[model samples]
Target chain A: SPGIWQLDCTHLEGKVILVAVHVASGYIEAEVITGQETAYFLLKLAGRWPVKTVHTDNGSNFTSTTVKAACEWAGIKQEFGISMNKELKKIIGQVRDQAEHLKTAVQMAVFIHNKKRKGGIGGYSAGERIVDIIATDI
Target chain B: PGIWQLDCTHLEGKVILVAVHVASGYIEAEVIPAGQETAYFLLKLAGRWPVKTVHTDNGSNFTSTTVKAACEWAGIKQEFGIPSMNKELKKIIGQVRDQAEHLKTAVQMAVFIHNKKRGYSAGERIVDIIATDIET
Candidate 1:
């Protein structure tokens, strides 16, 4: 729960979406940028997530420095690469063509996705992961 | 142990986000810019105090993917609530902007003033309501 990561990207319209999906809670957060998703926003987005380590696949966004200067700024450890981008793109891509309010539909898809999350791994709602993490050592 | 409802309002066409702690009647807000910047407001709200669930409406702002990202990342339950606090927030925003005292600074002054007033009024009554509802 404490050590997890959420980082990736997908798009809509002329805008690019930098994705960050919270794995444990089964919820999503993404950014819609006009130009392109930059290292500046990446750093800002990284701060918003707060993880010990940030996985990267070396786009301009995550290309800052591996000595962890950016990670130091966020107070996080940095490391690899995976396409979590598809995770969110799959949700939005389906209906973006059919939806009028792109922003609303984008987040609406996310809202439904979050609601669909019942219990992963099926062990008593996964013992309610979010609460279970805190309740663990308490 | 309770929810905080945060939302946006306008005065003279300026965007302001207000947060009302439903249980304590403790109010705070930010004079944030438009667009995805609305997502950033949660950072300020969370740093001020931690909560169990964060109640927000289905406005384009609150429904923002980035906003959901922050809530989920921070381990908060994203739920929904109502209008009164936004009503009061608009009240303060108008007063602050009218005074022309460098926006955010003026807004803070008005917010604390309202916060103090809330403490003596609805806040206490709210506490009593919760206590009376309990089997205590």
Candidate 2:
């Protein structure tokens, strides 16, 4: 929780949700994509925040030339996670196996994590901490 | 800690296979073309080494049917890493970044250097551990 957002992707019923979690605020941002063009969604997320660096696992799309160029152009240095952290893995595993409308369910999950869950150092919800600067659509 | 992930770094437009032994922080790298041939290369690595679980990002080369079948045949379980988790492999890859122009030569040296080096937290050389395990 000391670095950039831990980015990951999970899917349910063939629908993929791209997830980005903020380190300090316990906030998460996500998007639904039909295919593995993760760079497009990543760029979209970059636009919403004053992002400095992005941390991710070694997904093929994350290493693609297009994504690299886009991040470079945006001046966001990309970093990789060492291995799947247990905490993050649990979240993805739970979201990926949803039996219902996963896209909305995943978004709702992020909303609750950010707005209701109180796990940050500041004792405020992720949404409460970043409310003035950024507002998550999820 | 037994779980491991395989990734490839690009040098001079060529792909270099990078296998990170996550449990021990050991690294193996090889310069190869970007195609189905990586499956064989991976199989050979797995055969020579003791591997339990294999993790890979959604690279086209890894997602191919041929590669999937080979992993199955080898009795290896494969999964995709979180998208951002790839940076762990990239950090190891950055060791060879300066010499990327030389491609194959640079990667070979990088692998050699990496295998001999000890991790900050682990504090044990990978080769030494492997050698000791083999001897025992």
Candidate 3:
């Protein structure tokens, strides 16, 4: 839900493994054995969850033709992590706060969060919080 | 006192002109009133001297701004007349052979024949000047 999530392909040798981690909750989402970091990776991620945006560096691997083409195909926007911009400070700060709030070992926090989270239209659980953030639109 | 001499300033009240041969040291003057032929006449005088340059008396007329302008426009340097520089001008005007000094003898013969046979006018205005070589 917060903090930085990087697709670390540095030590990766086998395939373009897609790893999504909620820094607040210790909930990790991963997909392995993919070909390259392409737009398909974004499409697949967006299809599962509301992924409004993702920030990345200017590496050829990140700005690959396939990756950009897939982002366009999936109607998702990509942001470059320019070190100078202060525009997204509030959003990133919120993420940092959420991550810190939900941070615990996966074994400990997943149960607590899941119980609090709501699953159905009018149902509530201990794992779900009323997250009516701008992320809801994306 | 160097070498050559000429009566440059003595030309006042006379029709002043410089004359020299193209190859010899002889120079003569025909002091005519200044007129259209002044430049041409000077050129002819210079022709007689066989000179590379010509010198002139510095009277207001010869050194007139108009004459000076014309000479400059024609790419010739105007020189002032003094006996010493006159020699320099004489040598420069042009060069001629040894025969130029003998023209007077030839003219005497012609004048005598015209007077005896053709009754040429020779009264009070009979010519009196004769050209002989200047002692170098």
> What's the residue-level lDDT of B17 in candidate 2?
76
Q: Per-residue CA lDDT of candidate 2, range B42-77, in tens?
A: 554443344557787676656577567546645567
Q: Rate the local accuracy (lDDT) of all candidates.
A: 0.52, 0.53, 0.33
Q: Which sections of candidate 2 miss by over 4 Å?
A: A1-3, A34-36, A82-100, A119-122, A131-138, B1-136
User: Which digits, one per residue and each the tens of the lDDT, describe model 1 over residues B55-116?
Assistant: 76675645577667657644667776554766775576566555433565456545644654
Cα lDDT of model 3 by residue, B41-113, tens digit: 3332221111234454555436455445334423334556644424443332223212123222222222222
A17-99, model 2: which lDDT tens digit per residue? 67776666555666566222455555444433445677776765554875775566446778877322344345545654442
Give fnat of each prediction, in order: 0.00, 0.00, 0.00
CAPRI classification of candidate 2: incorrect
On DockQ, the candidate that comes out on top is 1
- Give the interface RMSD of candidate 1: 11.4
TM-score of chain B of 1: 0.71
- On DockQ, who's better, 1 or 3? 1
Arranged by TM-score, best first: 1, 2, 3
Give the lDDT of residue A26 in candidate 1: 47
